[PDB]
Amino acid sequence: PVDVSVSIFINKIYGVNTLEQTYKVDGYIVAQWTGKPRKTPGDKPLIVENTQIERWINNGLWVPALEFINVVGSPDTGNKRLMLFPDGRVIYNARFLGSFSNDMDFRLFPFDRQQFVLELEPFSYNNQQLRFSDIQVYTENIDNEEIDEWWIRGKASTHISDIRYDHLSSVQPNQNEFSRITVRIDAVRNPSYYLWSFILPLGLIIAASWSVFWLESFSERLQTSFTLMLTVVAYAFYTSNILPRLPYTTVIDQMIIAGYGSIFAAILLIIFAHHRQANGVEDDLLIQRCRLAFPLGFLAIGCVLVI
Amino acid sequence: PVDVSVSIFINKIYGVNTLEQTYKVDGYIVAQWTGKPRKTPGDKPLIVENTQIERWINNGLWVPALEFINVVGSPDTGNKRLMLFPDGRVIYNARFLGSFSNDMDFRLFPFDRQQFVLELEPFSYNNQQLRFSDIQVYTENIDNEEIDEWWIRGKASTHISDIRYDHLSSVQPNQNEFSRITVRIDAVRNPSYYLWSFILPLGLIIAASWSVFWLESFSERLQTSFTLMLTVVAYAFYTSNILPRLPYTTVIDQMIIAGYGSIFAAILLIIFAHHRQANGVEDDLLIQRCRLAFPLGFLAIGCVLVI
Amino acid sequence: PVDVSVSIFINKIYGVNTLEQTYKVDGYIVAQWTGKPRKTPGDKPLIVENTQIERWINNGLWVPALEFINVVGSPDTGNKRLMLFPDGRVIYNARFLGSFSNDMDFRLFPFDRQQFVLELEPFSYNNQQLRFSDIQVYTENIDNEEIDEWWIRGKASTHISDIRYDHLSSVQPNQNEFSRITVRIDAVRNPSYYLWSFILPLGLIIAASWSVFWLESFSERLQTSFTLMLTVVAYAFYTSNILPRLPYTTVIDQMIIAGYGSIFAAILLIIFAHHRQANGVEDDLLIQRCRLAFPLGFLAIGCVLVI
Amino acid sequence: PVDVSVSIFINKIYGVNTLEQTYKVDGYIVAQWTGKPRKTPGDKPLIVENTQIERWINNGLWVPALEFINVVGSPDTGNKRLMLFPDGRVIYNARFLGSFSNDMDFRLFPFDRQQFVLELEPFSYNNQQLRFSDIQVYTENIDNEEIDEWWIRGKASTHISDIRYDHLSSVQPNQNEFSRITVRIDAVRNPSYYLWSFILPLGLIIAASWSVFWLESFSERLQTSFTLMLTVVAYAFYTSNILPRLPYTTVIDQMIIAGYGSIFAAILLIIFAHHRQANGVEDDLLIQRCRLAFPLGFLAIGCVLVI
Amino acid sequence: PVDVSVSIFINKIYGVNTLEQTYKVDGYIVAQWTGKPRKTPGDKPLIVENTQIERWINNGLWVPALEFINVVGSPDTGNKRLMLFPDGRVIYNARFLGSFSNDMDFRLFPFDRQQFVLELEPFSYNNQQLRFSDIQVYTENIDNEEIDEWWIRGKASTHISDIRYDHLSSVQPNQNEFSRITVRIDAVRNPSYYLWSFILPLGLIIAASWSVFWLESFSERLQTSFTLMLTVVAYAFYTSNILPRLPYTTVIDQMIIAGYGSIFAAILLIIFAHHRQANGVEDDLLIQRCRLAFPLGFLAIGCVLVI
Ligand code: NA
Ligand code: NA
Ligand code: NA
């Protein structure tokens, strides 16, 4: 095979779309292999700029195509340089821009700890014809800085693995596995905006929903609970545009569920308190000891749910 | 005709847009036919990368164009390889990315069970000049995994059928039918998010709407019903952006209809209870036996509507 | 002139955007004219696939360009075949995809009855150099089926007319008129979703707004009317994203107007009832005979407005 | 210089985006200059269709590039004809489609009276090498018709002016000014939809906010004012998506401001009426003469604000 | 190296997207270097228009590619002129259009004072082979005018710095640093729209929330506070689409936080006032001296928070 050395530079990571679970990564790729010795004008290496490499490719120069596996849509490439040394090595430098995708598990939404994965693999040549020697990822632009609400932490993990493509074994009998480079960049979500915009207001809504039992008569406490459940419905919409549709529940969706449960349990308890009287003579105070028991049970529920 | 063998590899299915009834499928296509024996440099097969196939096509090589019938917009193709063996066969490998469309029947919205259809057909050569022998679809990347809220179940159904184009019979007298490959991938929607975000909150709203009859006087129960119907209007908006405009009613839209019906039937019954008095002396308890009859009728309605 | 025969095939009509008054039409166009006899390899006709027609065009073959007049944006063309018979005729087959536009009058919104218009006209050759003989439109894919909320009814109307371009008369003295093909496909909007999502809920809101006069005192009936007008404001937003900005009023906007009018007329009547007392001794029942007169006038208004 | 005559045809103006202050204009451009006499096949003029003009341009034909100065993004050109007469003149006909921009002053929003400006200027040749003789704009398609909510009024104003580019004076010593064509199309916004959707409902909200002073006690009138200010907040959102962010106030934003001012002045006046009692014995009627004075002052404010 | 002189002209800055922290800059770039003397037809300089420069580039002319570092997506270039003087200098004039990005710090949101940064750097040639001599930025189109809600103030700051690329040092031993031009355009946000749309309405909401303590009994003041907190929730949504997700709090988000704090502190104080009675005989006036103390503390909080 041909020993190909890659040096991926990351310019910036931007536009991390949580709803679509995609992100956009800019930067440069510098692939370098070796070939036969060639003659250049002077001792200096030749610079082959874009839209003119095609004359060299139609001349017979071996320029492989390196594609991104996990990309979404066509990667919007820009300028490209094919720098030709006369000692033998050929260097293909290109700028890439594309939307990449990952799994992006969302069990803990505001306190999330994710990673951004770049995958590179030759489109046509397998590991018997093109082998990746090593990659050095230069993430010095975003090594210790925060993009949007994501704090990039650590360096970039590099890994070279041989992926196997069973769909291509009908045209290649034995050699049908490809050398893939994986680049992993960790990212920790900053939870401050969610903490002061969704979590603590909903805690205040929960305390206000607890405040129904301090009232004195029945219609006023029903209207109190109903106008509280209306503003609980108000926060049901706000979370519909910050995280996608998930089979599980996150922290904020569990808080919405707890708000609905607290308010409707209060309404049912108030109804059962009102219809407690068989002949309309009994006072209703024995079941209304939930001024100091219902918040305690709610705190126990929250403490269990945190762990 | 020419016997063409296709091997479609599916990389990932993403972005299933329910409102537009489209979805995006990435992957590779490997078409393979046979031709005259040719000579290559060495015994090894020749690899013809992208943007250089045109020299071979202008030289006179037969490379058919395979289009997607059910695609929406232009399929955003990427890299392509035209691998030439010297024993005779020509292999056209290409990467595709495009938005596909299907019927996507939506009778049961959250408990839906749909399929994703890929259709492939030659654009110009009919079955008398190009015949699809067989297709093996390698859906091993998403064989037993869940994309977004869709759990992909089973393998990919393959079928080769001869479709007939009557619009082209004016230029082709007898042979005007084309061989189309259909690839069917089943998908079952995960109903959990809808279950805890729309169905059970609306059930709590229904019980709260039932709670009007436990009040004691008239103006308070009217205001109770009105502030309940306001939060029923609140959920009328939330469902407007999760499923498209349909002639029929789904489960959630039927629940909205049942909420409106319950609240307005309660308001009309309360009004008729108030105006039951001919001279203002009669008590109103005979018509207010719906504390234990109106929910029973609603449960009967729901049980009939489920089946 | 040259007699050109067109056979437009319609694959699917999708994405009818009411707010933008555009729609997207896929399918194929098959133009066919006649020319000098030519020699082909063998007796079989020659197939000229895409991205290779340019060699024949630079060789000197007459391939006219047929553009779409009413299209929005560039029509996203795909594959194209230039099928050359040796008996003389040249057949240009191409696939088109583009957003088309029409007037789309919206007097009756949910019970609308619209049409989809495709217009085709040569870009450069007038009727003295290129004449459309006839068109057969093969709308067999959507002849008797419903797209989105639009039921396609009937076949496709064909018409050939000579349009006149006065802007081009400075460069062409007498012959400056072009032969345009118009294809009309009727479509009837399915009114069910609007009927059970906007019309009947707003009727229930109207009846609830009528229900104010059954109350007994003043502050409660004002708060009743105010919390009803709030949920009338709630439906003012929902209709803002289903139909564009229009100088006139549709059915649903007239229902919103009637809701505002009913509620504010009720508020003004209640205020005038309260201030009817010169010295605070008069009872207010003479002006509150609108329990059986205000709905009757509203029904008369609606019956007049329907016709 | 070379005398160039332009004849701009306007097909349709669509998609006037008020928030972005852009609009889309379709149509054709017909540029015509004169040159050396040439020989054509026969006496007829030659038609040079698109994607084949490049052979004539590489042959040495002078085809200038005319760009649009005020365009947003790349103007999506379509088909183009380079019609060559043998008597000497060369005619460049092209179809354009692009998003144009203007200042679009918005002092009176619903009763606006705007214009749509098209600017054309050669990219490379100044007025010493290419001079625009005259332009005739053929706006006969939209001369007396209304697009969206904009009624196009009058014809199209034509003007040829020499614009000066000081950035290019380092490479051109004296001749660095360019001949620009400006095309002005007036448009009057139809105010009906805003009149019956925002202006008159907000007037009803204003009258309902005036209705607080007719109540009898304090808590009910506070809750009345609060539930009115809630639906004033409801219309604060609806206007956020119909006009962009502006330093000044339009008519509708002034109505929102007047609604907030009326309601909060009523609340402050009610509070000062309640705390008017030094010992709780005084009646509060002297300050509540605003049943017939507060609307009069509001009418004076509105009459001053209109002029 | 080669001395390259740049003269950037700015046509217009538009579409400053605060949520994405990007902006769009149109205009022209005029690069100019020197080379060997050449012969042109006549004494006049040669004009090389677009899509024909490639013949000169394949002939062997040195045209460097200048890229934008901070751009988002591919910069949508338009027309380009390569003006060749016979005295030796080569002038590359091109039009650019692209979305640029900056840090855009948002500590004070409505009273913001930002800058727009354009960065230009050769893609392939380092400072040993191409050196930027000087840049004159001609921002005369927007020198003293306001774009959208941004008032452009001052001229454009020019700076030439040598940036160092450590990722490219594996292919270049010592010379691996590039000359970058930075263009800084200051912009001050106009705070008027935010001042009369968010700041002063929320101040009125704060005063209305203070108004709870003037009521007389308990259930009415709870419902007062609850229906005030509902319209505080109403403004929590409106600010979600004008500024992005930030770790810190701006002015308006601090006002929302202060509104929630004031209302829930009032609710807690009212609850503690109600449960102040050990046996139900004590009057509650000592803790309700916050009619003249709670606003004073709130004013102290606001005065501290401003500085
Ligand atoms: Na309320
Ligand atoms: Na509300
Ligand atoms: Na919304």
mmCIF file of all heavy atoms in Angstrom, chain D residues 161-182:
data_model
loop_
_atom_site.group_PDB
_atom_site.id
_atom_site.type_symbol
_atom_site.label_atom_id
_atom_site.label_comp_id
_atom_site.label_asym_id
_atom_site.label_seq_id
_atom_site.Cartn_x
_atom_site.Cartn_y
_atom_site.Cartn_z
ATOM 1 N N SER D 161 -26.943 57.574 -14.687
ATOM 2 C CA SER D 161 -26.061 58.447 -13.934
ATOM 3 C C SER D 161 -24.666 57.846 -13.918
ATOM 4 O O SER D 161 -24.492 56.632 -14.029
ATOM 5 C CB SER D 161 -26.562 58.656 -12.502
ATOM 6 O OG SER D 161 -26.738 57.412 -11.845
ATOM 7 N N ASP D 162 -23.670 58.712 -13.778
ATOM 8 C CA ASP D 162 -22.278 58.297 -13.700
ATOM 9 C C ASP D 162 -21.870 58.220 -12.235
ATOM 10 O O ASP D 162 -21.664 59.255 -11.592
ATOM 11 C CB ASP D 162 -21.372 59.267 -14.456
ATOM 12 C CG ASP D 162 -21.844 59.521 -15.868
ATOM 13 O OD1 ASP D 162 -22.891 60.179 -16.034
ATOM 14 O OD2 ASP D 162 -21.170 59.067 -16.814
ATOM 15 N N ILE D 163 -21.754 57.008 -11.712
ATOM 16 C CA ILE D 163 -21.312 56.801 -10.342
ATOM 17 C C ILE D 163 -19.790 56.775 -10.335
ATOM 18 O O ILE D 163 -19.149 56.427 -11.333
ATOM 19 C CB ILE D 163 -21.924 55.518 -9.732
ATOM 20 C CG1 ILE D 163 -21.991 55.626 -8.208
ATOM 21 C CG2 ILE D 163 -21.166 54.269 -10.154
ATOM 22 C CD1 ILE D 163 -23.101 56.521 -7.712
ATOM 23 N N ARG D 164 -19.204 57.192 -9.218
ATOM 24 C CA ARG D 164 -17.762 57.330 -9.086
ATOM 25 C C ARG D 164 -17.249 56.351 -8.041
ATOM 26 O O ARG D 164 -17.774 56.301 -6.923
ATOM 27 C CB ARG D 164 -17.387 58.761 -8.697
ATOM 28 C CG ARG D 164 -15.907 58.965 -8.443
ATOM 29 C CD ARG D 164 -15.106 58.831 -9.722
ATOM 30 N NE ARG D 164 -15.129 60.051 -10.519
ATOM 31 C CZ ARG D 164 -14.375 61.115 -10.284
ATOM 32 N NH1 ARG D 164 -13.513 61.146 -9.282
ATOM 33 N NH2 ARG D 164 -14.485 62.176 -11.079
ATOM 34 N N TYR D 165 -16.227 55.581 -8.402
ATOM 35 C CA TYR D 165 -15.643 54.581 -7.517
ATOM 36 C C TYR D 165 -14.228 55.010 -7.160
ATOM 37 O O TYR D 165 -13.311 54.896 -7.981
ATOM 38 C CB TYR D 165 -15.663 53.202 -8.170
ATOM 39 C CG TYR D 165 -17.008 52.538 -8.060
ATOM 40 C CD1 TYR D 165 -17.641 52.013 -9.173
ATOM 41 C CD2 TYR D 165 -17.655 52.454 -6.837
ATOM 42 C CE1 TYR D 165 -18.878 51.415 -9.068
ATOM 43 C CE2 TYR D 165 -18.889 51.858 -6.725
ATOM 44 C CZ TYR D 165 -19.496 51.340 -7.841
ATOM 45 O OH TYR D 165 -20.728 50.743 -7.725
ATOM 46 N N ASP D 166 -14.053 55.501 -5.933
ATOM 47 C CA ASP D 166 -12.757 55.994 -5.492
ATOM 48 C C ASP D 166 -11.806 54.875 -5.094
ATOM 49 O O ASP D 166 -10.596 55.110 -5.018
ATOM 50 C CB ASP D 166 -12.939 56.957 -4.319
ATOM 51 C CG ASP D 166 -13.424 58.324 -4.760
ATOM 52 O OD1 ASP D 166 -12.796 58.915 -5.665
ATOM 53 O OD2 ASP D 166 -14.433 58.808 -4.205
ATOM 54 N N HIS D 167 -12.323 53.670 -4.841
ATOM 55 C CA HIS D 167 -11.464 52.544 -4.495
ATOM 56 C C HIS D 167 -10.661 52.045 -5.684
ATOM 57 O O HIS D 167 -9.637 51.382 -5.494
ATOM 58 C CB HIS D 167 -12.296 51.394 -3.928
ATOM 59 C CG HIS D 167 -12.714 50.386 -4.952
ATOM 60 N ND1 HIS D 167 -13.702 50.632 -5.880
ATOM 61 C CD2 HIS D 167 -12.282 49.126 -5.190
ATOM 62 C CE1 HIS D 167 -13.860 49.567 -6.646
ATOM 63 N NE2 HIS D 167 -13.010 48.638 -6.247
ATOM 64 N N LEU D 168 -11.105 52.343 -6.897
ATOM 65 C CA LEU D 168 -10.484 51.835 -8.106
ATOM 66 C C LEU D 168 -9.541 52.857 -8.731
ATOM 67 O O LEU D 168 -8.945 52.584 -9.777
ATOM 68 C CB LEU D 168 -11.589 51.416 -9.087
ATOM 69 C CG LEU D 168 -11.339 50.558 -10.324
ATOM 70 C CD1 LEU D 168 -10.896 49.177 -9.895
ATOM 71 C CD2 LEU D 168 -12.591 50.470 -11.158
ATOM 72 N N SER D 169 -9.369 54.020 -8.098
ATOM 73 C CA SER D 169 -8.524 55.071 -8.651
ATOM 74 C C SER D 169 -7.038 54.774 -8.519
ATOM 75 O O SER D 169 -6.227 55.464 -9.145
ATOM 76 C CB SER D 169 -8.835 56.410 -7.977
ATOM 77 O OG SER D 169 -8.425 56.402 -6.621
ATOM 78 N N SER D 170 -6.658 53.783 -7.713
ATOM 79 C CA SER D 170 -5.253 53.408 -7.624
ATOM 80 C C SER D 170 -4.794 52.647 -8.858
ATOM 81 O O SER D 170 -3.600 52.649 -9.174
ATOM 82 C CB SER D 170 -5.007 52.568 -6.369
ATOM 83 O OG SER D 170 -5.556 51.270 -6.511
ATOM 84 N N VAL D 171 -5.718 51.999 -9.564
ATOM 85 C CA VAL D 171 -5.370 51.252 -10.766
ATOM 86 C C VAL D 171 -5.792 51.973 -12.042
ATOM 87 O O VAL D 171 -5.320 51.606 -13.129
ATOM 88 C CB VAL D 171 -5.985 49.838 -10.728
ATOM 89 C CG1 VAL D 171 -5.688 49.167 -9.398
ATOM 90 C CG2 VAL D 171 -7.472 49.885 -10.996
ATOM 91 N N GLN D 172 -6.661 52.977 -11.946
ATOM 92 C CA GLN D 172 -7.057 53.794 -13.087
ATOM 93 C C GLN D 172 -6.836 55.247 -12.686
ATOM 94 O O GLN D 172 -7.478 55.722 -11.727
ATOM 95 C CB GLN D 172 -8.512 53.534 -13.477
ATOM 96 C CG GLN D 172 -8.761 52.136 -14.021
ATOM 97 C CD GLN D 172 -10.233 51.779 -14.066
ATOM 98 O OE1 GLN D 172 -11.063 52.447 -13.450
ATOM 99 N NE2 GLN D 172 -10.565 50.724 -14.799
ATOM 100 N N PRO D 173 -5.949 55.980 -13.363
ATOM 101 C CA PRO D 173 -5.564 57.316 -12.882
ATOM 102 C C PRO D 173 -6.676 58.355 -12.944
ATOM 103 O O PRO D 173 -6.936 59.042 -11.952
ATOM 104 C CB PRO D 173 -4.397 57.697 -13.804
ATOM 105 C CG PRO D 173 -4.586 56.866 -15.030
ATOM 106 C CD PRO D 173 -5.213 55.584 -14.575
ATOM 107 N N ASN D 174 -7.337 58.481 -14.088
ATOM 108 C CA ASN D 174 -8.353 59.509 -14.268
ATOM 109 C C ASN D 174 -9.738 58.951 -14.542
ATOM 110 O O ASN D 174 -10.714 59.425 -13.954
ATOM 111 C CB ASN D 174 -7.950 60.451 -15.413
ATOM 112 C CG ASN D 174 -8.816 61.690 -15.478
ATOM 113 O OD1 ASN D 174 -9.193 62.250 -14.451
ATOM 114 N ND2 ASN D 174 -9.133 62.126 -16.690
ATOM 115 N N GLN D 175 -9.855 57.954 -15.413
ATOM 116 C CA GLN D 175 -11.145 57.371 -15.772
ATOM 117 C C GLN D 175 -11.451 56.219 -14.813
ATOM 118 O O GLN D 175 -11.000 55.086 -14.999
ATOM 119 C CB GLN D 175 -11.156 56.964 -17.248
ATOM 120 C CG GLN D 175 -10.004 56.076 -17.750
ATOM 121 C CD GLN D 175 -8.798 56.870 -18.209
ATOM 122 O OE1 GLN D 175 -8.663 58.053 -17.900
ATOM 123 N NE2 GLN D 175 -7.912 56.218 -18.952
ATOM 124 N N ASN D 176 -12.210 56.522 -13.759
ATOM 125 C CA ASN D 176 -12.582 55.508 -12.782
ATOM 126 C C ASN D 176 -14.031 55.667 -12.342
ATOM 127 O O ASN D 176 -14.378 55.342 -11.202
ATOM 128 C CB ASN D 176 -11.647 55.538 -11.569
ATOM 129 C CG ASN D 176 -11.695 56.854 -10.821
ATOM 130 O OD1 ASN D 176 -12.414 56.989 -9.836
ATOM 131 N ND2 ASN D 176 -10.923 57.830 -11.283
ATOM 132 N N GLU D 177 -14.890 56.151 -13.235
ATOM 133 C CA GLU D 177 -16.305 56.333 -12.953
ATOM 134 C C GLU D 177 -17.136 55.527 -13.941
ATOM 135 O O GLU D 177 -16.774 55.400 -15.113
ATOM 136 C CB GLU D 177 -16.687 57.816 -13.000
ATOM 137 C CG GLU D 177 -16.248 58.543 -14.251
ATOM 138 C CD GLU D 177 -16.306 60.048 -14.092
ATOM 139 O OE1 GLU D 177 -17.408 60.575 -13.837
ATOM 140 O OE2 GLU D 177 -15.249 60.704 -14.221
ATOM 141 N N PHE D 178 -18.254 54.988 -13.461
ATOM 142 C CA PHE D 178 -19.029 53.995 -14.188
ATOM 143 C C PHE D 178 -20.448 54.493 -14.421
ATOM 144 O O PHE D 178 -21.021 55.199 -13.585
ATOM 145 C CB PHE D 178 -19.068 52.662 -13.425
ATOM 146 C CG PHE D 178 -17.784 51.884 -13.490
ATOM 147 C CD1 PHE D 178 -16.655 52.320 -12.816
ATOM 148 C CD2 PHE D 178 -17.709 50.711 -14.214
ATOM 149 C CE1 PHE D 178 -15.481 51.609 -12.875
ATOM 150 C CE2 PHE D 178 -16.533 49.993 -14.273
ATOM 151 C CZ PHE D 178 -15.418 50.445 -13.600
ATOM 152 N N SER D 179 -21.016 54.110 -15.562
ATOM 153 C CA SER D 179 -22.371 54.499 -15.928
ATOM 154 C C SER D 179 -23.359 53.483 -15.366
ATOM 155 O O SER D 179 -23.336 52.311 -15.750
ATOM 156 C CB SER D 179 -22.515 54.602 -17.444
ATOM 157 O OG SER D 179 -21.838 55.740 -17.942
ATOM 158 N N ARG D 180 -24.232 53.936 -14.476
ATOM 159 C CA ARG D 180 -25.181 53.076 -13.786
ATOM 160 C C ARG D 180 -26.594 53.415 -14.234
ATOM 161 O O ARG D 180 -26.951 54.593 -14.331
ATOM 162 C CB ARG D 180 -25.060 53.237 -12.268
ATOM 163 C CG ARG D 180 -26.125 52.498 -11.480
ATOM 164 C CD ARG D 180 -26.097 52.859 -10.011
ATOM 165 N NE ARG D 180 -24.905 52.351 -9.350
ATOM 166 C CZ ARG D 180 -24.681 52.440 -8.047
ATOM 167 N NH1 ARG D 180 -25.559 53.001 -7.232
ATOM 168 N NH2 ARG D 180 -23.548 51.953 -7.550
ATOM 169 N N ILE D 181 -27.389 52.386 -14.508
ATOM 170 C CA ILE D 181 -28.807 52.535 -14.810
ATOM 171 C C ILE D 181 -29.605 52.237 -13.551
ATOM 172 O O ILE D 181 -29.376 51.216 -12.894
ATOM 173 C CB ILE D 181 -29.237 51.603 -15.952
ATOM 174 C CG1 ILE D 181 -28.514 51.955 -17.246
ATOM 175 C CG2 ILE D 181 -30.713 51.689 -16.167
ATOM 176 C CD1 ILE D 181 -28.703 50.918 -18.325
ATOM 177 N N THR D 182 -30.537 53.122 -13.210
ATOM 178 C CA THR D 182 -31.437 52.928 -12.083
ATOM 179 C C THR D 182 -32.869 52.823 -12.590
ATOM 180 O O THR D 182 -33.308 53.654 -13.389
ATOM 181 C CB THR D 182 -31.312 54.077 -11.085
ATOM 182 O OG1 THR D 182 -29.928 54.386 -10.888
ATOM 183 C CG2 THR D 182 -31.927 53.690 -9.759
#
